[PDB]
Each structure stands twice: as structure tokens, then as C-alpha cells.
Ligand binder design. Structure first.
Ligand SMILES: CC1(C)CNCc2ccccc21
Length: 150
């Protein structure tokens, strides 16, 4: 009963969260997960500021209202060479990664490790935050509030 949450640097308080290293988060689980990080889904404006601070990924993830990939550098295999906040227009499917926004974060690039999920609740799941440098923080708990997600 174990969940890995892969997280990134924060950029103006925005970071990327990838569940179990695969597209596997629904829109409702996304909201709950950001809540567990005392965070919210970013707005498009918040994402655009993050991007300007140096944030890019090669993964689809939820923000408030859309599924996007922030791109700085054009790369053929990431959002088809687009730069800027690329918006997913057409897809059959509903599960992606998520982005989260933490207002308490530093204003620009913060590439320190994440070492807590301060707002997770009581539960049976071993939840592991995995940083990009491999550093890990684990705790027993739960964050999903929708039965359909469990
Ligand atoms: C950069 C990213 C999301 C890419 N997929 C693997 C992984 C693992 C730990 C932290 C971050 C990542």
C-alpha cells in the first residue's frame, strides 16, 4: 500500500508532481494532492510567471482549467517543439500528472528538496516524496477524498 510522489523544483511557488512515475492522477485526485502539499492547482497566470522564472517539464499536468506543459526550450518530443505554456487541446483520456502552487515558496527558483506533505491526513498508505536528487521523505497517511480515486 505505497505511493511515490515525484516532485520538482518550485518556480514562483509552482512545481510538478508525478504519481508513481506514470500518468495516473485524475482531476479530483490532483486537487486533493495539491491540498496535501498546502498548495492549490495553479492558475494560467501563476504558471506563466513560473515559466518566466525558468520552469519547464516534458509532462502533461493539471492546472486550474486545463492540462498543460510549460516549455522554455523547443524539443521535438515535448509538446511538439512549442515554447510557452503549451495547452493540451485534444485527448481521449483523463489521467495526467499535476502541477501545484505553494504561495509560501520563494519567489524565483527553489531547487531545494521537499521534505514533507504537511497537510496529508490519517491513513494506511506509505506515501513517499521522491526528489529529483533521489532524497526521500516518507509518512503513513492518505490525501484522496474521492472514493472513485481509491
Ligand atoms: C523530473 C521527474 C518528474 C521526471 N520523472 C522522474 C522523476 C523522479 C523524481 C523526481 C522528478 C522526476
Amino acid at each position: 500500500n505505497q505511493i511515490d510522489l515525484n516532485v520538482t523544483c518550485r518556480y514562483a511557488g509552482v512545481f510538478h508532481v508525478e504519481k508513481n512515475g506514470r500518468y495516473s492522477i485524475s482531476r479530483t485526485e490532483a486537487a486533493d494532492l495539491c491540498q496535501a502539499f498546502n498548495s492549490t492547482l495553479p492558475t494560467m497566470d501563476q504558471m506563466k510567471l513560473a515559466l518566466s522564472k525558468g520552469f519547464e517539464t516534458c509532462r502533461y499536468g493539471f492546472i486550474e482549467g486545463n492540462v498543460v506543459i510549460p516549455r522554455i526550450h523547443p524539443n521535438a518530443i515535448c509538446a511538439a517543439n512549442h515554447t510557452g505554456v503549451y495547452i493540451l487541446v485534444t485527448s481521449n483520456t483523463s489521467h495526467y500528472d499535476t502541477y501545484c502552487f505553494n504561495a509560501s515558496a520563494p519567489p524565483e527558483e527553489d531547487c531545494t528538496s521537499v521534505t514533507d506533505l504537511p497537510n496529508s491526513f490519517d491513513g494506511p498508505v506509505t506515501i513517499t516524496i521522491v526528489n529529483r536528487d533521489g532524497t526521500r521523505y516518507s509518512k503513513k497517511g492518505e490525501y484522496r477524498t474521492h472514493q472513485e480515486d481509491i
